[model samples]
Target: IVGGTESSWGEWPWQVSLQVKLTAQRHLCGGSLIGHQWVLTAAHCFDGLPLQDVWRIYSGILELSDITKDTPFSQIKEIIIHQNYKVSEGNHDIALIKLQAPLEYTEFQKPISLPSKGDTSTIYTNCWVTGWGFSKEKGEIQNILQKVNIPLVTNEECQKRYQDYKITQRMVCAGYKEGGKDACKGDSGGPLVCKHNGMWRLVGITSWGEGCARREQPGVYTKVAEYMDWILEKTQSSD
Candidate 1:
């Protein structure tokens, strides 16, 4: 995150990293632990339609160096991307990952709640996003988890900023008008969580933007609030 700071340990338990089981083992993108055996992320993460077995899920870690041999993780069972997701335009950019086994919950690893089905009555403000993405545009990839409080941006306002970029209802925007802070590269598929009645709900999934923390361009997210029913249905149909 360009404008985010290091987050304390266990601050965002739902945050996770997606990595391939190749020799390099570098984390490709961020993900959310939404269920015992399910993970939520952006469909573009696997743009090439990679095999599920090649992917692995690493959770409950704050820093990249903290990973060791004994650290527990989940192997992939299946992956499901949104039917209407468009790679060119990046609309409906959401996907689900099913794990071969369930990762037990702990203080540092937990699932985040989803907003009520078809729920858009409540106005969202004062939300937080956490990730270990880049520190700046074309900068080093940060290892430590970082977080910042950015409120949601209205579609009407976001459209004005994005001109040619069509602002679809499935997408959401967040950041200040003069952007100094926002999600960047490697933060894709991470959660944009908001507190509602003391429980944190997954409101958005980091999608795309013009640039990292650029003025007049805010981070776009896959509005989870708009897909609660689809998420639940898909997460269950395969179960």
Candidate 2:
């Protein structure tokens, strides 16, 4: 959420806060509701952590500290991490969360539509990235959700900027060359939505970056289009 401002409640219904009660209730990362009982997040979020704990998913809440009494929270029944996920390389950084109960859709709890078959070809020049992540490096996580518009950068351009790291086809980069605005800590796994033909589609999932927002270092996300098949396969499975 670096270089972001407070986001309005229900503005991004699909946005979800992934939380855990380590010392006190804390936001681990952000995610998106892709189905009635399914959520999409980053696999690295649960890395090195025991899945036995009650992982809570909070919806329709803009401010984490002051959640409305009517807001909904779900306990995770199962977590399906992508089999090829590697935290070291930030590859296949995606996961699905099965809620113990179905989500009650509301203006603030609706699921975002995924990119249709072959819809990935369109260039998403207009897009927004949202989260409750930190506003600055080593800063405290914001109480309210924050969002900022970021331009999608081509993999070729990103590769030239980030030569030391690999920018694979499975990943997408976003932000400006100056790098003033981008997602930060606790924002990982959130949605990078693009509006097209009057419909908002989930284009990317917040993955990783060099720092909060550094010059020539744009934020990288897991390209949702390339993994659509994987997502559908896992979500439809009976395991």
Candidate 3:
């Protein structure tokens, strides 16, 4: 979010700040509240980590340091990583985390709607991405949540730039050709929401990139629409 602005509380209520023990209590990655008890994020966020590893989900808060007595907190009950997730090259990088307790929807905590099946028509030309990630590459992490508007990039165009990495149908690109706004290191697993037909829908899950806001290298994300059925299967099975 190098070239972004501070987002107001409740503006992106579905946004979740994932905190984990990385040396200390750190804001590891971002996630989206997809249900009362389910959160979707990038599998790479917890790759190689034990399922027993403790994770804290912070919701209804704009500033990381503004944790109040009423802020909703949940202990991760379990993590469901995509069966085909590959950390070596960053493919199928989506995952869902089930909370020990379902979150109560408030003005500051709510679920984002997923795109319907066969609804790949959702345009990504310009969408919003928010998180508590870094403002720049190797820069200080922001205490306040940041948001930016990025244009959607086609896989064909994205593949041309990231020829080394395989940009598959499961992935989508966002940002400028010259590169200015994007999700940084800590923004992985966050939502890339787009307004479709006058309603906001979760379009992408922040995944990876060549570098933060690099020229011709937009941020990559897991296409949520492509996994709609998979998400429903996993989430409904537990219900």
Candidate 4:
């Protein structure tokens, strides 16, 4: 999370730290818990890493060092990425991971609600993003969770200002034209939640952006609402 502040424990209950269970844990990407044992992340997260490990998904923890052997977590059962996802254009950039066993939810670890068809009918501003990613453009991952409050930008304006990249309907923009605050490296696949009827429902997934909060570009997110049926089918048909 670049240009962000420290996030308290349980602030974003669904935040999941996807780590490469190596000699020392390497934070790969941020994920969101959407079901009993299902995690939604970004397809790009597994670009080069082998999906052949017990890669643990840590939840309910704020600081990285807080991960204990007893911390609530689970190993991957399967990895699924959107079939239509295009790396070049970055369309349908979302992916899912099925844990070996259902994670017993605690007050600190729970799933977040996805947006309904009507939820995305209008634009929303009360949204935030959280992660344990690098806080600086070229810095190390932070020990603590970081969060940033960002406003959504209409794709119409974003496409114009972005100049080259096309902001597809599958994507949503959130940031300031002036820059300074936005999601950065290592924050990929994290949640961009918005307050709807008091509950923070996931509206976007940290997909891509021009740079680390560049003044000219608004951060882009995988518009989760647009893939509601895809999510339902993917989760339900997994046998």
Per-candidate TM vs. native? 0.95, 0.95, 0.94, 0.94
Q: Report, for every candidate in turn, its global Cα lDDT versus the true structure.
A: 0.86, 0.88, 0.87, 0.86
- The candidate that wins on lDDT is 2
Error of 1 at 239 (Å): 8.3
Which runs of model 3 end up more than 4 angstroms from their true locations?
21-23, 51-53, 68-71
**Could you give candidate 2's per-residue lDDT for residues 1-239 as a string of tens digits?**
88888888789999999988665677889999998899999888888657636467898888898754465688888888889877666889999889889988899889999989867578986899999888887887889899899999999998888889889999999988898899998999999999999999999999888887888899999999999999888888575
Determine which window of 10 residues in candidate 1 has minimal summed lDDT: 117-126
Worst 10 residues of 4 by lDDT: 46-55
User: Which regions in candidate 1 have their CA more than 4 angstroms from the true location?
Assistant: 237-239
| Model 1, residue 219: C-alpha shift (Å) | 0.8
Question: Candidate 1 clashing pairs?
Answer: none
Instruction: Residues 1-239, candidate 3: write the lDDT tens digits.
Output: 76899999789999998986455677889999999999999998887558535678898889988765465578888888899876765888999899999888989899999988757665655599998888988887799999999989999999999888889998888989889888998898999999877878899999888779989998899999899888988988643
Give the C-alpha lDDT of model 3. 0.87
Q: What is the lDDT of residue 18 in candidate 1?
A: 90
Clashing pairs in 4: none
